[PDB]
């Protein structure tokens, strides 16, 4: 599908057996999701943007379904105000910018 | 053009007669540029990112060209880690997400 940018590009995703709303974010290198209790191992990480840094937990090889498109990769979990789908997963669903 | 997301979608912009590199950021509502000198009046504002809130100068109705596509809209100037082009200008150049 084609998504216009009049409003925030929010889409439904499926991760760890849960449906969530997430932002398709071409400005995010990696995916960052709101706090959730994912099983498995993880390693600490710090990611920065406007306002400074937040501490996140990096999970590897996490399967996420984005608008019926499946994708598996790195997922960061921490106190982000929004679920953010980053380029590491956007490439896996064939997402492009067009103008 | 069509832009894949295996690399940061960086483009050259022109604002105030000066060239810069900026990030096409579908996850940003607004356009925020690093500290620079711009002509015209402004008003202090606050904007929140992943790491908190920062103080920015709001310039209204500023001419800005993005990949040879002209836009005229709001430009925020402050201590952002990266020059980001937000949806307020992405819509003006006809940018969409496609997958
Ligand atoms: C700054 C950019 C280079 C990088 N970020 C992506 C942006 O899209 C960010 C997303 C966002 C964060 C918080 C609330 C809404 C959207 N948007 C943003 O700051 O927009 C500002 C200006 O316009 C307003 O609209 C929304 C907020 C205001 S990041 O979040 O910090 C980030 C950093 C590292 C990783 C892992 O690699 C993943 C994500």
Automatic annotation (TrEMBL), chains A, B:
One Gene Ontology MF term: aspartic-type endopeptidase activity
GO BP field: proteolysis
CC terms in the record's Gene Ontology section: host multivesicular body; virion membrane
One protein family per Pfam: RVP
Domain Peptidase A2 intervals: 20-89
Subcellular location: Host endosome, Host multivesicular body; Virion membrane
Stored Gene3D superfamilies: Acid Proteases
Sorted UniProt keywords: Aspartyl protease, Host endosome, Hydrolase, Protease
SUPFAM superfamilies registered for this protein in UniProt: Acid proteases
PROSITE patterns cross-referenced by the UniProt entry: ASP_PROT_RETROV, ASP_PROTEASE
Membrane topology qualifier: Lipid-anchor
Name this protein carries in UniProt: Protease
């Amino acid at each position: 599908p084609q998504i216009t940018l009049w409003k925030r590009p929010l889409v439904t995703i499926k991760i760890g057996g849960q449906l969530k709303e997430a932002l398709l974010d071409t400005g995010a290198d990696d995916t960052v999701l709101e706090e959730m209790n994912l099983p498995g191992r993880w390693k600490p990480k710090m990611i920065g943007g406007i306002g400074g840094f937040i501490k996140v937990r990096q999970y590897d090889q996490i399967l996420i379904e984005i608008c019926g498109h499946k994708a598996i990769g790195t997922v960061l979990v921490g106190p982000t105000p929004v679920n953010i789908i980053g380029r590491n997963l956007l490439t896996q669903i064939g997402c492009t910018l067009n103008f």
